[PDB]
Amino acid sequence: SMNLERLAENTGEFQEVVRAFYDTLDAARSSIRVVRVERVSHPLLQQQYELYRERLLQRCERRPVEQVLYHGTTAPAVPDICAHGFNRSFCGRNATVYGKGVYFARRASLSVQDRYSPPNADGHKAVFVARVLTGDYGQGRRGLRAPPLRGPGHVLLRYDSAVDCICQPSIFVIFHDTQALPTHLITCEHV
Numbered sequence: 470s471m472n473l474e475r476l477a478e479n480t481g482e483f484q485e486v487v488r489a490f491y492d493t494l495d496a497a498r499s500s501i502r503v504v505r506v507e508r509v510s511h512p513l514l515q516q517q518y519e520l521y522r523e524r525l526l527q528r529c530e531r532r533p534v535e536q537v538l539y540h541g542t543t544a545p546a547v548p549d550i551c552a553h554g555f556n557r558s559f560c561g562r563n564a565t566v567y568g569k570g571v572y573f574a575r576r577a578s579l580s581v582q583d584r585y586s587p588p589n590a591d592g593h594k595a596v597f598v599a600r601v602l603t604g605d606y607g608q609g610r611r612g613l614r615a616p617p618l619r620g621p622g623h624v625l626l627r628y629d630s631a632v633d634c635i636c637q638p639s640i641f642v643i644f645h646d647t648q649a650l651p652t653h654l655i656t657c658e659h660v
């Protein structure tokens with residue numbers, strides 16, 4: 470099993486991944502076309518992620534502890550994410566407004582913007598689909614190196630993730646190597 474393989478279009482899995490992507494494209498639904506879908510395989514990261522998930526299901530209060538989220542990226546960054554997973558140390562110096570972590574969107578309409586998934590010379594855009602252990606979340610801010618502090622009224626000292634808004638979150642920020650698993654890569658383009 471190779472790290473990146475084309476997903477056959479005669480499968481229920483292909484139809485389900487494409488339907489969830491279109492369901493959260495909002496105003497961009499009629500201007501985006503799917504070119505192909507690929508399955509990501511990283512056996513060591515998947516096994517380490519599943520152990521973290523089991524621990525969170527036993528400890529965490531909020532349900533669900535896991536969410537399916539989107540991550541737009543550049544064409545040259547694709548092989549490194551497939552081979553090693555997501556890495557907060559490569560966040561860069563620009564626009565880390567909710568901390569030095571890896572950023573995920575609840576809605577495909579955010580990650581499909583050219584500022585997050587810029588097209589290559591052939592017009593193709595890269596958007597990963599990932600299983601993310603969001604658990605209990607707190608407010609994100611610039612300079613965070615780990616999730617924010619819980620404060621008084623809690624035994625645990627830090628949250629599991631950071632967000633843009635604590636009431637209706639649209640962006641989640643992750644600060645641990647085994648807390649997000651890339652499962653699919655959607656290649657898309659402007660109609």
Ligand SMILES: C[C@]1(c2nc3cccc(C(N)=O)c3[nH]2)CCCN1
Nearest residue numbers: 539540541560564572573574580585
């Ligand atoms: C600009 C930055 C980023 N912010 C995002 C907010 C929502 C979605 C994504 C995404 N990639 O789909 C974001 N990426 C932060 C540090 C380097 N990437």
